[PDB]
Design a protein around this ligand. Structure first.
Ligand SMILES: Cc1cc2nc3c(=O)[nH]c(=O)nc-3n(C[C@H](O)[C@H](O)[C@H](O)COP(=O)(O)O)c2cc1C
Ligand code: SF4
Ligand code: SF4
Ligand code: SF4
Ligand code: FES
Ligand code: FES
Lengths: 72, 227, 442, 156
């Protein structure tokens, strides 16, 4: 995982009655916190712009310079 | 024509350049700006090999295999040390400004830049400064534009303008701020604009229709069919 | 030395310069041996004879590369089916530290016009273009006035001197890029395109401007031509006892007493120029370095001040003669700051075509900025040396990046202590990610 | 929005007469429009492309390649100070500091009244008389930081 999303946690009580019930969907997996990695955010690294992070606001990124700028 | 690559002797066509001759022989030379249909221009400087004047030459000289004819009795080396370091350095120079985008990039697993980065053996980053960024353009319903991932290999403009005859794509700007796209937002007018998603070796131009329901290339089930 | 006796035999390019620095127009130019070489060339010599005379005179290119002009002119095709040949005058002069063509075009435009006329008759070129930079307003005005005067006098246009040779001269003003001075990029910018250079072969002599045979020559080379054709080949060989024939505009700039430009024979000592002509360094300043031929040349020290200003003599010293307009660096100048300024110029004047220049000059700029701020890290100087090794000739698409890495190479070679003093913090480009133990390499 | 004037079109066609290929007049067409209007807007790119018979992408690539063709609005007077190596030796940084103190702008910006725009530029070919400045068409040499306010108030 390049985002530390999927994690294996110290829990072993997972027995079931039917085998179809061992198919865990997204609502059965998505916990409310960061798990074992408390601070990492992939979208703070990626250059792809999302809400709250426009171009140039990721880590180690300069602001975009338009080709129409007067500076050489 | 007779060429000698890394001590081995090969019979090639003299009308071909060294890159296409060596690729036809199964040898692996990294390359970006050359395309079999578009010709050679010598932009990306990735296809460097070491050419010797004769058999009894030990110094040699770094040349671009796409810009060098595969003439008779041509002595070159691909696995030469200095050529390998230069190709790795070209990959590193491309990697200095490249965004940390592979998980959220539609080219991932189908990306020529990823393959050539792995092929040159470059995996360690020592560049510590900022990366240049670019604003994207709206290119219509078919092609999605992500200008951050560009390596300035000029394949898109050469295909679109010289090959396909299109008029609304071009290269703008200057030194390290080169921008490949349209002069303004709008749909790409060419009837053959969709080939940019395979012409572009990075994830700048991607299939937007595929991007709506994206999956990786290894997860695909393919068949040979007729349009 | 200030008392300079400028004779036409010893100073063929500057002997008719006026004392008030005013331009010499057509009547004053023709009053002093004006268009005599053009008349002799167009009325008594074959174009092949003129090309052979220029080749035998040993005239080399003054634009920086030093290639011989006669061999460049001999590369043109011989067939009559190609007769749309072009002559281009590289009046760009955008290399920092170069100010000679400005003087030549501002005060002696008719010398340039006569040289273009002779070279166009020799090259059988029906059209000439002066690719001039846009910052030279007075040079453009004077060149256009001189072209109008020569067209009025019958020296330009249709049936020049009754020979039957047709030649028109245009002035194409530039739009402000240093890469336009490169000859193939000059051809590209003349065609109204982005000024990317072209791969050679083919050379412009076979397919240049608009696919036609084309010869690009510096202003000073074309200004050297009419003296050769008016005074003779043996006169041109018998003015300097050096391997480079003829005179050359040489100067010294910087914090010297008398910065300027003087026409001197080849083989003149750089120390001779700096002391006699430039007057030495200013008061309280000690000489520490010099660049022989502009911003794209290697730095040399005070021990190299005694070698003659020739192509080969500076070639073995580890530098290039270049434009032969040297620049002096005194002890008050930080070499890291100077090389930083040079590399910012070279990185922002890249045309963007090829990877090593475009993506490796900004890396060197950022490293030099870090060394300037005292924020250098280990491996920075090794990265700079790797950049100089991997941006040499053949590695990049044109010669802009080798000229870019020459001063960085020479400054690291000589003044390494300042670059080592720039490094003050340990190497790091990884943040600490909580929950992940790092791979502590050794 | 944009429309080329009669003088602009006539000058562009007269420059088109001087070349084998009409594409070769693109730089001077952009410079003509810049001289008339201060800079080159986007409609100027399209109009020059229509007059010259070349695509607008080529005109825009030319306009954004060359630094002296302005694709952004500038002030009434363009100060262009040399930041190259000989003027760095001769002390251009004092001149730049004096200009920034007098105009209260960064290099690459325009003053609030639209009177001055400050730009670094490459070597002006006047290195023996450095440091050098280039206001709209006038080259000023032998600059000192004390003479900057005197030099700036003669350009209204
Ligand atoms: C980056 C670069 C910039 C150059 N700039 C100029 C220039 O401004 N003026 C010039 O005469 N030559 C310049 N040259 C040299 C030309 O390529 C060419 O050698 C010259 O213009 C004509 O050759 P000549 O010296 O035989 O006359 C430059 C070369 C390079 C690589
Ligand atoms: S273009 Fe290739 S290397 Fe770049 S982010 Fe996309 S997959 Fe990764
Ligand atoms: S957009 Fe793609 S094809 Fe065009 S220059 Fe950039 S990497 Fe090459
Ligand atoms: S070295 Fe390469 S990118 Fe740099 S100016 Fe020359 S061709 Fe352009
Ligand atoms: S593939 Fe040869 S330089 Fe790009
Ligand atoms: S370095 Fe400033 S005018 Fe040349």
């Amino acid at each position: 995982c390049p985002t530390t999303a999927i994690q294996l946690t110290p829990d072993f009580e997972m027995g079931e009655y039917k085998r179809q019930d061992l198919v865990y969907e997204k609502e059965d997996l998505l916990i409310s916190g960061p798990g074992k990695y408390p601070e990492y955010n992939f979208y703070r690294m990626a250059g792809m712009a999302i809400d709250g992070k426009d171009k140039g606001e990721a880590e180690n990124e300069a602001k975009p310079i338009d080709v129409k700028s007067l500076l050489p | 024509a007779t060429i000698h690559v890394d001590g081995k002797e090969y019979e090639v066509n003299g009308a071909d350049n060294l890159l296409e001759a060596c690729l036809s022989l199964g040898l692996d030379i990294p390359y970006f700006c050359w395309h079999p249909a578009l010709g050679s221009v010598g932009a990306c400087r990735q296809c460097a090999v070491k050419q010797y004047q004769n058999a009894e030459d030990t110094r040699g000289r770094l040349v671009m295999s796409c810009m060098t004819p595969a003439s008779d009795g041509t002595f070159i080396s691909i696995d030469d040390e200095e050529a390998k370091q230069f190709r790795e350095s070209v990959v590193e120079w491309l990697m200095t400004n490249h965004p940390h985008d592979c998980p959220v990039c539609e080219e991932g697993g189908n990306c020529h830049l990823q393959d050539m980065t792995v092929m040159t053996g470059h995996s360690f980053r020592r560049y510590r400064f900022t990366k240049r960024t670019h604003r994207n353009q709206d290119l219509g319903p078919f092609i999605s534009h992500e200008m951050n991932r560009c390596i300035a290999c000029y394949r898109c403009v050469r295909y679109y303008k010289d090959y396909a005859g299109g008029t609304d794509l071009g290269v703008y700007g200057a030194h390290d701020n080169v921008y490949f796209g349209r002069p303004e937002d709008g749909t790409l007018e060419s009837e053959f604009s969709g080939n940019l998603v395979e012409i572009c070796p990075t994830g700048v131009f991607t299939d937007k229709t595929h991007s709506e329901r994206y999956n990786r290339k290894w997860d695909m089930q393919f068949a040979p069919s007729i349009c | 030395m200030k008392n300079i006796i400028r004779t036409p035999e010893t100073h063929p390019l500057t002997w008719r310069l006026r004392d008030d620095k005013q331009p010499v127009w057509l009547d004053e130019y023709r009053s002093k041996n004006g268009y005599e070489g053009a008349r002799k060339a167009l009325t008594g010599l074959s174009p092949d004879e003129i090309v052979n005379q220029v080749k035998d005179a040993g005239l080399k290119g003054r634009g920086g590369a030093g290639f011989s002009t006669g061999l460049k002119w001999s590369l043109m095709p011989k067939d009559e089916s190609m007769n749309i040949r072009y002559l281009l005058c590289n009046a760009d002069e955008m290399e920092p530290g170069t100010y000679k063509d400005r003087l030549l075009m501002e005060q002696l435009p008719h010398l340039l016009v006569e040289g273009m006329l002779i070279s166009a008759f020799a090259l059988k070129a029906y059209r000439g273009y002066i690719f001039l930079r846009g910052e030279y307003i007075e040079a453009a005005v004077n060149l256009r006035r001189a072209i109008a005067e020569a067209t009025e006098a019958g020296l330009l246009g249709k049936n020049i001197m009754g020979t039957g040779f047709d030649f028109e001269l245009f002035v194409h003003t530039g739009a402000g890029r240093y890469i336009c001075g490169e000859e193939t990029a000059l051809i590209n910018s003349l065609e109204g395109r982005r000024a990317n250079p072209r791969s050679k072969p083919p050379f412009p002599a076979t397919s240049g401007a608009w696919g036609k045979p084309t010869c690009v020559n510096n202003v000073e080379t074309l200004c050297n031509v009419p003296a050769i054709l008016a005074n003779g080949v043996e006169w041109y060989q018998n003015i300097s006892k050096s391997k480079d024939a003829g005179t050359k505009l040489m100067g010294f700039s910087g914090r010297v007493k008398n910065p300027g430009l003087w026409e001197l024979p080849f083989g003149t000592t750089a120390r001779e120029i700096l002391e006699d002509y430039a007057g030495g360094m200013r008061d309280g300043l000690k000489f520490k370095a010099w660049q022989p031929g502009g911003a794209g040349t290697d730095f040399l020290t005070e021990a190299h001040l005694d070698l003659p200003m020739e192509f080969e003599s500076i070639g073995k010293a580890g530098s290039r003669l270049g434009t032969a307009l040297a620049m002096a660096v005194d002890h008050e100048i930080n070499m890291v700051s100077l090389v930083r300024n040079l590399e910012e110029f070279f990185a922002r004047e890249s045309c963007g075509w090829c990877t090593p220049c475009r993506d490796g000059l900004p890396w060197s700029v950022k490293i030099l900025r870090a060394l300037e701020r005292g924020e250098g890290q280990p491996g920075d100087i090794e990265t700079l040396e790797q950049l100089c090794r991997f941006l040499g000739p053949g590695k990049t698409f044109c010669a802009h990046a080798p000229g870019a890495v020459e001063p960085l190479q020479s400054a690291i070679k000589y003044f390494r202590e300042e670059f080592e003093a720039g490094i003050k913090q340990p190497f790091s480009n990884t943040h600490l990610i909580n929950g992940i133990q790092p791979n502590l390499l050794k | 929005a944009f429309e080329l004037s009669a003088a602009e079109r006539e000058a562009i066609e007269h420059e088109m007469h001087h070349y084998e290929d009409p594409r070769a007049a693109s730089i001077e067409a952009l410079k003509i429009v810049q001289k008339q209007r201060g800079w080159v807007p986007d409609g100027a790119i399209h109009a020059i492309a229509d007059v010259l018979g070349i695509p607008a992408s080529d005109v825009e690539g030319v306009a954004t390649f060359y630094s002296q063709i302005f694709r952004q609005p500038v002030g009434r007077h363009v100060i262009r100070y040399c930041d190259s190596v000989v003027c760095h030796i001769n002390g251009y940084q004092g001149i730049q500091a004096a200009l920034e103190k007098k105009l209260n702008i960064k290099p690459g910006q325009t003053t609030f009244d639209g009177r001055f725009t400050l730009l670094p530029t490459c070597c002006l070919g006047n290195c023996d008389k450095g440091p050098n400045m280039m206001i709209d068409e006038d080259t000023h040499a032998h600059l000192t930081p004390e003479a900057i306010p005197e030099l700036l108030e003669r350009y209204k």
